Structure 1
Amino acid sequence: PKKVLTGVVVSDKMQKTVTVLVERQFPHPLYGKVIKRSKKYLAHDPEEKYKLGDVVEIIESRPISKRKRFRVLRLVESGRMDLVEKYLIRRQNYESLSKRGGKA
């Protein structure tokens, strides 16, 4: 079985490619809570067909570029911006968190 994951598009800005955000839950190896870690996959979109907000399936694939080792498999559910927002605001807050400084 070539691996298959499910996730969301968070990036158009690449040529024939999408960034897919994949979540995974699992119990913590010591404290046994269920924890929600995540990962970003670079997925070959040969036709631009997949837009951001699309949840997609993505499949293990013969290497495309340096980071691209997955092909976009099919569309699971399109239009789902809430997730993408959570990605961007998580990102935006990073520009805080610093030490060079802040404002008012």
Structure 2
Amino acid sequence: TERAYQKQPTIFQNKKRVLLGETGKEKLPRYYKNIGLGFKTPKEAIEGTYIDKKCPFTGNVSIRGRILSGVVTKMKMQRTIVIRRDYLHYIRKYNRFEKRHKNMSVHLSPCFRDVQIGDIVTVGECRPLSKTVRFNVLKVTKAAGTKKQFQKF
């Protein structure tokens, strides 16, 4: 569906299929972009429904530059999440390390489901999407502990 004023990326909808009268499907003309880099386009971009300007597999967002990895911390921002990159810093004087982290925002494409908090995600450099969002979610890697468990209700 759509809850905005227009969502139609590139593909022209009207093939004028009206020759004898049939409803047919409409999910076939979808712009299907492969990012390369040995990274698989997920099947949610094949048989999905979303229309996103900033999607790495649907929109015109070219992935270039650097490939980093973070851990998902928050979800509460619309179509973009905040990751944390833990790293160590060598200090010359005392001759051991310290923990430093920089919380970055990254555009979570709506094809990636099961994006629960605590999984290592791969991010890629792109053009500046907004003021704080420069990276783009590339591949969700970690299963975030155990996925087999279920609880009451």
TM-score band, normalised by shorter chain: 0.5 to 0.7
Alpha-carbon distance in structure 2 between the residues aligned to 1:27 and 1:70: 26
Distance in 2, matches of 1:76 and 1:70, equals 16
Tell me the matched-pair count. 80
Question: In structure 2, what is the equivalent of residue 21 of structure 1?
Answer: 84
Could you state the TM-score of these two structures normalised by the residue count of structure 1? 0.67
Cα deviation per residue 1:6-62 (whole Å; 9 max; x = unaligned)? 111111101010100001113114322122211111111121623322211111111
- Which runs of 5 or more residues in structure 2 are unaligned? 1-63, 146-153
Equivalence map 1:1-104=2 (5 Å): 2-47=65-110, 49=112, 50-80=115-145
Q: Tell me how large the CA RMSD over aligned residues is.
A: 1.8
| Rounded Cα–Cα distance in structure 2 between residues aligned with 1:48 and 1:41 | 21
Question: Which runs of 4 or more aligned residues in structure 1 lie more than 4 Å from their structure 2 counterparts after TM superposition?
Answer: none
Q: Which has the higher helix share?
A: 1
Letter matched to residue 83 of structure 2? V
Percent identical residues? 31
Rounded to whole Å, the distance in 2 between the matches of 1:19 and 1:62 is: 18
Question: Which gives a bigger RCO, structure 1 or 2 (Cα 8 Å, sep 6+)?
Answer: 1
Structure 1 unmatched runs, 5+? 81-104
TM-score by length of 2: 0.47
Please tell me whether Structure 1 or Structure 2 has the larger radius of gyration of its CA atoms: 2
